[PDB]
């Protein structure tokens, strides 16, 4: 269950949109990144419960939309800017400075293992899919074969290397080989439900395990060789619990969701049970949720923008 | 009888 362990108030006079936890740098140390529309800050632990701001980066014109975590990168922070759709992706680093990484009609973006960042733009025959690498500066850009169906989300497949998954506007799932750039397979998912947003994908025994969001989450099991979907697991709110899925995050085998309620709900994905509820503190509905990438914590944020950090065990 | 292939990935990559 959930133990409130620390917290972060960020009276930034700007709407808070996202948070994430990463290791920074001459030594790995767990930090928290907060993003508001017009400012992004890096924070370190002041003591057992308090956080202090170490760096800040400012954005005028186009508002910050999300943080984009990149596994195995500790010397910069990537963010996506845009009012609704993504227009730019920037890298923030230190004395604070920033670099424009990509610019245009961006539809989807995902940080990948080993310092890569994948993104896609356009919609059809115009679609491009690109994976860049950081050393770290703009080093390589490999195109991937586009499915010419708008990509809605990426997910790196846990349990293999070099497999990348996408979902498309067509309710299709695509798999690429990250090494060759090849599009290996396209597979339609029952025309609903339906999703659209893949939170996590796993490979085990030649089967694909795919977590989507609606029943608050769905696990679809697909045989990649036949293309056929082989079963489906449901994650549902307990006996009495109002609320529909609104957004969420999955780390390893845990899933968190912000419900239309305003409550956050948690599942262990192995077992399928809702392992905790977390009502809004005060009257402030939870605005975003993210698992910590450095440790065993759940980050829950309000537009306020106060962040509450819980210990999961 | 939907066959499962534990090597589907390198297979298609080949």
Give the SS3 label for residue A273: coil
> What's the CA gap between A309 and B12, in Å, rounded?
43
- Per the CB < 8 A criterion, the answer to whether A115 and A134 are in contact is yes
Give which of A45, A49, A37, A38 is closest to A3, Cα–Cα.
Answer: A49
Q: Which residues in chain B are closer than 8 Å to A223, comparing Cβ atoms?
A: 2, 4
Residues in A closer than 8 angstroms to B13, CB to CB, are 177, 179-180, 182, 184
Q: Does B14 touch chain A (CB under 8 A)?
A: no
B7 touches chain A (CB under 8 A): yes
CA distance readout (Å), A146 to A29, A133, A165: 38, 19, 12
Cα dihedral angle (A198, A281, A292, A25), rounded to 10 degrees?
Answer: 140
Please compute, for residue A161, the number of CA atoms within 13 A of its CA located in the half-sphere on the CB side.
Answer: 4
A142, A130 Cβ separation under 8 angstroms? yes
- Report chain B's terminal Cα–Cα distance, integer Å: 24
CA distances from A107 to A110, A123, A152, A255 (A): 11, 8, 7, 24
Contacts of B2 in chain A (CB under 8 A): 223, 226, 228, 230
Q: Which helix (H) or strand (E) holds B8?
A: helix B8-12
Share in percent of chain B as helix, strand, coil (round to 5) = 35, 0, 65
Q: Is B12 on the interface with A (CB under 8 A)?
A: yes
Choose among A195, A202, A199: nearest CA to A211.
A199
B3 touches chain A (CB under 8 A): yes
Which residue of chain A has the CA closest to B2? A226
Closest CA to A110 of A127, A130, A124, A95: A130
Break chain A into its structural domains and give their ranges: 1-313
| Residues on chain A bordering chain B, Cβ-to-Cβ distance under 8 angstroms | 160, 162-163, 175, 177, 179-180, 182, 184-185, 203, 205-207, 223-226, 228, 230
In total, the C-beta contacts within 8 angstroms joining chain A to chain B are 38
Nearest to A241 by CA among A273, A217, A271, A263: A263
Homologous superfamily of domain range A1-313: YVTN repeat-like/Quinoprotein amine dehydrogenase (2.130.10.10)
- CB distance from B4 to chain A under 8 Å? yes
Contact A177 B2 (CB under 8 A): no
From the list A162, A173, A178, A221, the residue with the least C-alpha distance to A197 is A173
Q: Which residue has the tokens 């905790």?
A: A276
d(CA A232, CA A229): 8
Q: Which residue of B has its CA nearest to A181?
A: B13
* Bridge-based pairing state of the strands A151-158 and A198-204: parallel
Residue A225 and residue B4: Cβ atoms within 8 Å? yes
Cα(first)–Cα(last) distance of chain A, in Å? 6
Q: How many CA atoms lie within 13 A of A229 on its CB side?
A: 19
Structure token pair of residue A61? 């014109």
Identity of the residue in B3, B7, B13 whose CB atom sits nearest the CB atom of A177:
B13
Residue A198: how many CA atoms within 13 Å on its side-chain side? 31
Cα dihedral A225→A231→A235→A238 (10° resolution): -170
For tokens 């999955």, name the residue. Answer: A250
Determine the residue among B3, B4, B7, B8 to mutate to test chain A binding: the one whose Cβ has the most chain A Cβ atoms within 10 Å: B8
């Amino acid at each position: 269950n959930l133990q409130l362990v620390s917290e972060l108030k960020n009276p930034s006079g700007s709407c808070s949109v996202d948070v994430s936890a990463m290791f920074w740098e001459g030594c790995k140390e767990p930090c928290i990144i907060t993003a508001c529309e017009d400012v992004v800050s890096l924070w370190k632990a002041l003591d057992a419960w308090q956080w202090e701001k170490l760096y800040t980066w400012h954005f005028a014109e186009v508002p910050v939309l999300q943080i984009v975590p990149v596994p195995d990168v500790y010397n910069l922070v990537c963010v996506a800017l845009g009012n609704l759709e993504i227009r730019e992706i920037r890298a923030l680093f230190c004395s604070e400075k920033q670099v424009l990484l990509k610019s245009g009609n961006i539809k989807a973006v995902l940080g990948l293992t080993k310092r890569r960042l994948v993104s896609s733009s356009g919609t059809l025959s115009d679609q491009q899919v690109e994976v860049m690498t950081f050393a770290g500066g703009g080093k390589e850009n490999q195109f991937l074969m586009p499915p010419e169906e708008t990509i809605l989300t990426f997910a790196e497949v846990q349990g293999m290397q070099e497999a990348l998954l996408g979902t498309t506007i067509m309710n299709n799932i695509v798999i690429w080989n990250l090494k060759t750039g090849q599009l290996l397979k396209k597979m339609h998912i029952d025309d609903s439900y339906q999703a659209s947003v893949c939170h996590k994908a796993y490979s085990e025994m030649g089967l694909l395990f795919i977590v989507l969001s609606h029943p608050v989450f769905q696990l679809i099991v697909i045989n990649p060789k036949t293309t056929l979907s082989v079963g489906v697991m449901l994650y549902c709110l307990p006996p009495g619990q109002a609320g529909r899925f609104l957004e969420g995050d999955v780390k390893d085998h845990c899933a968190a969701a912000i419900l239309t309620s305003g409550t956050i709900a948690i599942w262990d994905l192995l077992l399928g049970q809702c392992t905790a509820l977390l009502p809004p503190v005060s009257d402030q509905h939870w605005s975003f949720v993210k698992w910590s990438g450095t440790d065993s914590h759940l980050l829950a944020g309000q537009k306020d923008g106060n962040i509450f950090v819980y210990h999961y065990s | 009888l939907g066959p499962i292939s534990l090597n589907w990935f390198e297979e298609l990559s080949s």
